[PDB]
Write an enzyme that holds these catalytic residues in place. Structure first.
Site, PDB file in Angstrom:
ATOM      1  N   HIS A  40      30.743 -15.345   0.032  1.00 22.08           N
ATOM      2  CA  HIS A  40      29.435 -14.771   0.338  1.00 22.08           C
ATOM      3  C   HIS A  40      28.552 -14.759  -0.905  1.00 22.08           C
ATOM      4  CE1 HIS A  40      30.907 -10.614  -0.814  1.00 22.08           C
ATOM      5  NE2 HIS A  40      29.621 -10.415  -1.070  1.00 22.08           N
ATOM      6  N   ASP A  84      36.955 -15.126   2.575  1.00 23.57           N
ATOM      7  CA  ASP A  84      35.816 -14.908   1.657  1.00 23.57           C
ATOM      8  C   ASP A  84      36.245 -15.221   0.215  1.00 23.57           C
ATOM      9  OD1 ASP A  84      33.334 -14.269   0.678  1.00 23.57           O
ATOM     10  OD2 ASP A  84      33.551 -12.092   0.962  1.00 23.57           O
ATOM     11  N   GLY A 175      26.542  -5.910  -5.411  1.00 22.52           N
ATOM     12  CA  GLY A 175      26.419  -6.431  -6.765  1.00 22.52           C
ATOM     13  C   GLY A 175      27.787  -6.577  -7.428  1.00 22.52           C
ATOM     14  N   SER A 177      30.221  -7.795  -5.545  1.00 23.07           N
ATOM     15  CA  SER A 177      30.664  -8.953  -4.757  1.00 23.07           C
ATOM     16  C   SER A 177      31.216 -10.069  -5.628  1.00 23.07           C
ATOM     17  CB  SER A 177      29.467  -9.517  -3.964  1.00 23.07           C
ATOM     18  OG  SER A 177      29.009  -8.586  -2.990  1.00 23.07           O
ATOM     19  N   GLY A 178      32.407 -10.581  -5.261  1.00 21.06           N
ATOM     20  CA  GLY A 178      32.980 -11.738  -5.941  1.00 21.06           C
ATOM     21  C   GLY A 178      33.882 -11.369  -7.120  1.00 21.06           C
TER      22      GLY A 178
HETATM   23  N1  LIG Z   1      31.628  -8.347   9.487  1.00 17.27           N
HETATM   24  C1  LIG Z   1      31.677  -7.157   8.900  1.00 17.27           C
HETATM   25  N2  LIG Z   1      32.826  -6.737   8.371  1.00 17.27           N
HETATM   26  N3  LIG Z   1      30.556  -6.431   8.835  1.00 17.27           N
HETATM   27  C2  LIG Z   1      30.474  -5.106   8.199  1.00 17.27           C
HETATM   28  C3  LIG Z   1      30.094  -5.215   6.707  1.00 17.27           C
HETATM   29  C4  LIG Z   1      28.605  -5.464   6.450  1.00 17.27           C
HETATM   30  C5  LIG Z   1      28.129  -5.003   5.037  1.00 17.27           C
HETATM   31  N4  LIG Z   1      28.306  -3.553   4.877  1.00 17.27           N
HETATM   32  S1  LIG Z   1      26.975  -2.870   4.222  1.00 17.27           S
HETATM   33  O1  LIG Z   1      27.378  -2.304   2.913  1.00 17.27           O
HETATM   34  O2  LIG Z   1      25.978  -3.922   3.944  1.00 17.27           O
HETATM   35  C6  LIG Z   1      26.122  -1.583   5.245  1.00 17.27           C
HETATM   36  C7  LIG Z   1      26.733  -1.387   6.646  1.00 17.27           C
HETATM   37  C8  LIG Z   1      26.719  -2.434   7.582  1.00 17.27           C
HETATM   38  C9  LIG Z   1      27.277  -2.273   8.853  1.00 17.27           C
HETATM   39  C10 LIG Z   1      27.858  -1.051   9.187  1.00 17.27           C
HETATM   40  C11 LIG Z   1      27.869  -0.005   8.254  1.00 17.27           C
HETATM   41  C12 LIG Z   1      27.306  -0.165   6.986  1.00 17.27           C
HETATM   42  C13 LIG Z   1      28.792  -5.759   3.859  1.00 17.27           C
HETATM   43  O3  LIG Z   1      29.647  -5.200   3.155  1.00 17.27           O
HETATM   44  N5  LIG Z   1      28.319  -6.989   3.656  1.00 17.27           N
HETATM   45  C14 LIG Z   1      28.746  -7.821   2.521  1.00 17.27           C
HETATM   46  C15 LIG Z   1      28.457  -6.998   1.266  1.00 17.27           C
HETATM   47  O4  LIG Z   1      27.398  -6.378   1.205  1.00 17.27           O
HETATM   48  N6  LIG Z   1      29.368  -7.004   0.278  1.00 17.27           N
HETATM   49  C16 LIG Z   1      29.142  -6.239  -0.977  1.00 17.27           C
HETATM   50  C17 LIG Z   1      30.024  -4.973  -0.982  1.00 17.27           C
HETATM   51  C18 LIG Z   1      30.936  -4.765  -2.007  1.00 17.27           C
HETATM   52  C19 LIG Z   1      31.761  -3.633  -1.980  1.00 17.27           C
HETATM   53  C20 LIG Z   1      31.658  -2.699  -0.931  1.00 17.27           C
HETATM   54  C21 LIG Z   1      32.491  -1.556  -0.891  1.00 17.27           C
HETATM   55  N7  LIG Z   1      32.133  -0.389  -0.304  1.00 17.27           N
HETATM   56  N8  LIG Z   1      33.741  -1.662  -1.305  1.00 17.27           N
HETATM   57  C22 LIG Z   1      30.713  -2.901   0.091  1.00 17.27           C
HETATM   58  C23 LIG Z   1      29.911  -4.044   0.063  1.00 17.27           C
END
Ligand SMILES: N=C(N)NCCC[C@@H](NS(=O)(=O)Cc1ccccc1)C(=O)NCC(=O)NCc1ccc(C(=N)N)cc1
Ligand SMILES: [Ca+2]
Length: 223
Positions: A40, A84, A175, A177-178
């Site tokens: 991603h 991913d 941020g 991510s990765g």
């Molecule tokens: N197909 C799935 N599994 N969908 C759900 C995940 C979508 C998104 N989550 S989110 O932070 O942007 C907000 C959110 C979206 C949907 C429901 C509740 C809250 C998300 O995480 N998207 C990618 C992303 O933003 N990655 C960065 C990241 C890094 C670490 C964390 C963490 N809490 N460990 C979360 C996001």
């Protein structure tokens, strides 16, 4: 990283920042020519920044190297975050030293309860926004799949594992991510997804690197 601590400059020597005019993802140096990150995190025009602490200041141990090639996992599925993982080949070999060092691939999957280290330059707030200039660190245990099963409405696959805290306040975040989840000296995880950050009973989900070692070695060997 929410609820972590300042790592200290270059204490996480395999940590990289991916830069397309600004930091946008973490990654892990796995040898002098290759970095593992999240699918991603895929973008054109990636510059890989090694030896970074403060990402806004040239402190003297940075190495900036352009990517020659990015390879998203063949089966990456963006709507589920399944597989991913992405490899990035550097245009030139990094000069390895104590501040710029590779991290081992695992030989086996790590067990629940094991302590891991998650790091990155991501958001430090569970609500609102603050992006740090120096690298942040978080010690975090692997949780049982059973512990995290009911944490999401979204599919959780066997290419994912659960790391973090159920009590809230401590998590990776946007941020990050990765970036690396390292457990006992092995890259076991890649910061992938989660529902918000640092929310109660809502731990993060990480690409399970131990499932990908064959693909990684073969891809490196042939490119
Ligand atoms: N197909 C799935 N599994 N969908 C759900 C995940 C979508 C998104 N989550 S989110 O932070 O942007 C907000 C959110 C979206 C949907 C429901 C509740 C809250 C998300 O995480 N998207 C990618 C992303 O933003 N990655 C960065 C990241 C890094 C670490 C964390 C963490 N809490 N460990 C979360 C996001
Ligand atoms: Ca710097």
């Amino acid at each position: 990283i929410v609820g972590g601590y300042t790592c200290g400059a270059n204490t996480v020597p395999y940590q990289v920042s991916l830069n397309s005019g600004y930091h946008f993802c973490g990654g892990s140096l796995i040898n002098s020519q290759w970095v593992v990150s999240a699918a991603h995190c895929y973008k054109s025009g990636i510059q890989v920044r090694l030896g970074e602490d403060n990402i806004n200041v040239v402190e003297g141990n940075e190495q900036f190297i352009s990517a020659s090639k990015s390879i998203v996992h063949p089966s990456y599925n963006s709507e589920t975050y399944n597989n991913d993982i992405m490899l990035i080949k550097l245009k030139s070999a990094a000069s390895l030293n104590s501040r710029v060092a590779s991290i081992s691939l695992p030989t086996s999957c790590a067990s629940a309860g094991t302590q891991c280290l998650i790091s990155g330059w991501g958001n430090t707030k569970s609500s609102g926004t603050s992006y740090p200039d120096v690298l942040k660190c978080l010690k975090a245990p692997i949780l049982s799949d059973s512990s995290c099963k009911s944490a999401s409405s979204f599919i959780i696959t066997s290419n994912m594992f659960c790391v973090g805290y159920l009590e809230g306040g401590k998590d990776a975040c946007q941020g990050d991510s990765g970036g690396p989840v390292v457990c006992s000296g092995k890259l076991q995880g890649i910061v992938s997804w989660g529902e918000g950050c640092a929310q109660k009973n809502k731990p993060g989900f990480y690409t399970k690197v131990c499932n990908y070692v064959s693909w990684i070695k073969q891809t490196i060997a042939s490119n």
